[PDB]
Design goal:
Chain lengths: 17, 227, 230, 17
């Protein structure tokens, strides 16, 4: 838990045209 | 006009202009009708990127604030407060869209679970920046929304469904980070993983890549949090 | 308020990756009229480069879609109108930076290093205007970019060592100008090669303070050189 | 190669202190 810590929840991922 | 706003939002997405994207999808939601799967995801992608920027900034600034224990601290604090203000308004924006439009019109079980997971997520982001006075009640709104989504999901969706798995992943993170309960966060993550991996024959080609990705993230969190 | 408040907000805004805030702050600093320090100069540059770079990126994506949507009139018109929205945002950012350079930064640049740096910036921001210019405006805008780059180039040749990171950086960008704006790959290659070779000639002139920056830009010059030849 | 993702290979604002 630093200032550059990402909460490992659902990412906005697997998008494509 | 609905199609026109949807195509502009897709374009804003490719342009990485998420304020624009959010505005588009906001006004689509305000037209009243139930969103399709495509539309749903554009709304969440838009708003997720818009808050995310604030969460990321907030954390960096909070971190700076903590390791200046004097005048530099007042500046940081004030900048953090400016960022929190921005964040709350975005969170309240989405939650209003969820209460007034999306949750009421959710006819399918998957729409209902999806929007309740959202409700849980955005109260969780408010919890992240709330003080004792309001925090208790913000947390409970998040838990209540998650729990309802979890119960419907348990009844009406198969264990490999990307929305069930993604709900488990986020509710687990709620337990771990908001309620300081490693064990409850770990069993949620472990149950969702174990159930999905047992029913791996049930996956569609339409979402095998989503489901398997989320499974990996569950186990990653599990592996970290028990070690 | 005071310069030290605004400079420190800028630094904080940078760490937060909130570059509108950072830019606003350094615009205020600059508008107070006093010559900026090397630190302040970098904060202004970083701030505005990030702000305008978001538009350039977006513009390229939207333009690309506008091209692929030939024969789909309604999609193409939506892309066009969105590109035009991004273009006006991009111009305003560039006109903002350019007017700061004309009214404050170039006028008060007492030293040669500052002159080269600010004239390079002017070259850069007129280049960014050129990229989205079309018609009678383009050729005028392209000349303003070239003149700023040329003035900077001649001052740098005279006053700065061949390994100075601002000299080499100017060589790199002006080379990019010839390739991307004037359709002049050979000029662009020769300018890049010469800067690289004159830096090889005098590595002893590198300082401990900046050898990492110089050797990176040297690598970048040769990267562009080898691609455009190849 | 010029395309929608192409970045002009000009100077980066990088290697900060
Ligand atoms: O002692 P540490 O290794 O530095 O970690 C903890 C900290 C702190 C702790 O106490 P806090 O809850 O009052 O903030 C804690 C820790 C360890 C012990 C306690 C804590 C609590 C928690 C975690 C680790 C820690 C995991 C589970 C829970 C948590 C919430 C959010 C992200 C990660 C976690 C302070 C001090 C430090 C800390 C860091 C941050 C923050 C606050 C702190 C701000 C800004 C940044 C941050 C990241 C994510 C969310 C919120 C923040
Ligand atoms: O009353 P405090 O909470 O202990 O903090 C302030 C102080 C002071 C204040 O008045 P000042 O303008 O004459 O310095 C202030 C504060 C609080 C109230 C006023 C002030 C002004 C400001 C800030 C906090 C405070 C944020 C926004 C503005 C500011 C400028 C630079 C860094 C941080 C800040 C004095 C006394 C004290 C202070 C501390 C310093 C300094 C001066 C003071 C010198 C040396 C160190 C410093 C750090 C950064 C820049 C400059 C300094
Ligand atoms: O033929 P390609 O390999 O597909 O690349 C060219 C393209 C195009 C070309 O035609 P154009 O110059 O009239 O616009 C060209 C190319 C090749 C052949 C011609 C061209 C010209 C140029 C370059 C490569 C190409 C290098 C030197 C000159 C140039 C300017 C800016 C960046 C890079 C370059 C079209 C179609 C394609 C292209 C791509 C873009 C764009 C336009 C196009 C817009 C949006 C994106 C872009 C990136 C940077 C600046 C501007 C744009
Ligand atoms: O679209 P522009 O910015 O106005 O420049 C291009 C032109 C043209 C373009 O089409 P083309 O491919 O058939 O020559 C192009 C351009 C831009 C887009 C396309 C093109 C292609 C290329 C470049 C830029 C452009 C860079 C990479 C490729 C190229 C080859 C040789 C030198 C420089 C380049 C036309 C129209 C214009 C042009 C100019 C000339 C010529 C022809 C044109 C004749 C006469 C003069 C010239 C100079 C050098 C050799 C040949 C000529």
């Amino acid at each position: 838990r630093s200032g550059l810590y990402r909460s490992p929840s659902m990412p906005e991922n697997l998008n494509r045209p | 006009d609905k199609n026109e706003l949807v195509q502009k939002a897709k374009l804003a997405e490719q342009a990485e202009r998420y304020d624009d994207m959010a505005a588009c999808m906001k006004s689509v939601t305000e037209q009243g009708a139930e969103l399709s799967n495509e539309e749903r995801n554009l709304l969440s992608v838009a708003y997720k990127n818009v808050v995310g920027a604030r969460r990321s900034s907030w954390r960096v600034v909070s971190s700076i604030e903590q390791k200046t224990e004097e005048k530099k601290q007042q500046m940081a604090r004030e900048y953090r407060e400016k960022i929190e203000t921005e964040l709350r308004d975005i969170c309240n924006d989405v939650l209003s869209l969820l209460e007034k439009f999306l949750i009421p019109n959710a006819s399918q079980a998957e729409s209902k679970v999806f929007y309740l997971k959202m409700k849980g997520d955005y109260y969780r982001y408010l919890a992240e920046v709330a003080a004792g006075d309001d925090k208790k009640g913000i947390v409970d709104q998040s838990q209540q929304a998650y729990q309802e989504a979890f119960e419907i999901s348990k009844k009406e969706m198969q264990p490999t469904h990307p929305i069930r798995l993604g709900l488990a992943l986020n509710f687990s993170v709620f337990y771990y980070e908001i309620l300081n309960s490693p064990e409850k966060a770990c069993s949620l993550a472990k149950t969702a993983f174990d159930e999905a991996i047992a029913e791996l024959d049930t996956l569609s080609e339409e979402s095998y890549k989503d489901s398997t990705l989320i499974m990996q993230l569950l186990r990653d969190n599990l592996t970290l949090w028990t070690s």
